[PDB]
Structure 1
Amino acid sequence: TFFNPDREGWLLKLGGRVKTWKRRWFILTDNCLYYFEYTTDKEPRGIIPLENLSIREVLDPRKPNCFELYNPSHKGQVIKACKTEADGRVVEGNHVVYRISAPSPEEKEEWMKSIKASISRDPFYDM
């Protein structure tokens, strides 16, 4: 599934039920954002489907080159996502939004462009 990706790279993501930044290797493919703790990891740490989502720039007090993923449909609606836990639990994410920090302004722009392009490409988008 990670074959022929639209983009791969390091990004910082702000935690949900425990708000802290974690460095994760992201892979954009099949209109989903996959993230790994380490680049050569066989299995992803989580998956964030992009369908029905939007992206916007945001200013953070400590992290630069940030943007957020959010669902426009319903107010404060929990974004559909899935993640693995060390104990083996495969649990659904509880994020209303996803604040991401890119390594540079250039990479932020590139990532925002790729994500939007992927979303608009989905033939099942906005239904």
Structure 2
Amino acid sequence: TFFNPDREGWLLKLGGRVKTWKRRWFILTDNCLYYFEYTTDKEPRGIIPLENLSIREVLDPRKPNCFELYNPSHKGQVIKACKTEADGRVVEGNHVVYRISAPSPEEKEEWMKSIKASISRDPFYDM
């Protein structure tokens, strides 16, 4: 699944119910954003399918180079996603938005472009 990735790199992500920022290694592939706690981890911490989502730039009080993934068709609608819990649970995400912070302005632009291209490339886009 992780072979032939569209982009890989470190990004800071804001939590769902609990609003805490975590540094995660992201992998964009198969029109999904997989994230890992550590780069060499065998298992992803979570997966965010990009189908039906949009991206928009945002300004954050503390974190620079931010953007958000959100569902444009249904405001306030929880984004379909799946992640693991320390106790072993595999559960659905609780995010209405995914606020992400990139390491640099350039990396923000590259990530936003890669994600948008992935979403548009999907043959089942807007269906």
Distance 1:75 1:53 in 2: 11
Give RMSD over aligned pairs.
0.4
Once the two structures are superposed, the pairs formed by residues 69-108 of structure 1 within 5 Å of their partners are 69-108=69-108
Structure 1 unaligned regions, length at least 5: none
Identity in percent: 100
- Deviation per CA, 1:13-69: give whole Å up to 9, x if none: 001111010000000000000000000000100000000000000000000000000
Q: TM-score, normalised by structure 2?
A: 0.99
Query: Offset of 1:86 from its aligned partner?
Result: 1.1
Q: TM-score, normalised by structure 1?
A: 0.99
Secondary structure, aligned partner of 2:25: strand
Secondary structure, aligned partner of 1:119: helix
Distance 1:104 1:38 in 2: 20
Query: Offset of 1:87 from its aligned partner?
Result: 1.0
Name 2:57's counterpart in structure 1. 57
Name 2:111's counterpart in structure 1. 111
Misfit runs of 4+, over 3 Å: none
Aligned length: 127
Distance 1:117 1:126 in 2: 14
- Deviation per CA, 1:72-124: give whole Å up to 9, x if none: 11121110000001111000001000000000000000000000000000001
Name 2:31's counterpart in structure 1. 31
Distance 1:62 1:86 in 2: 27
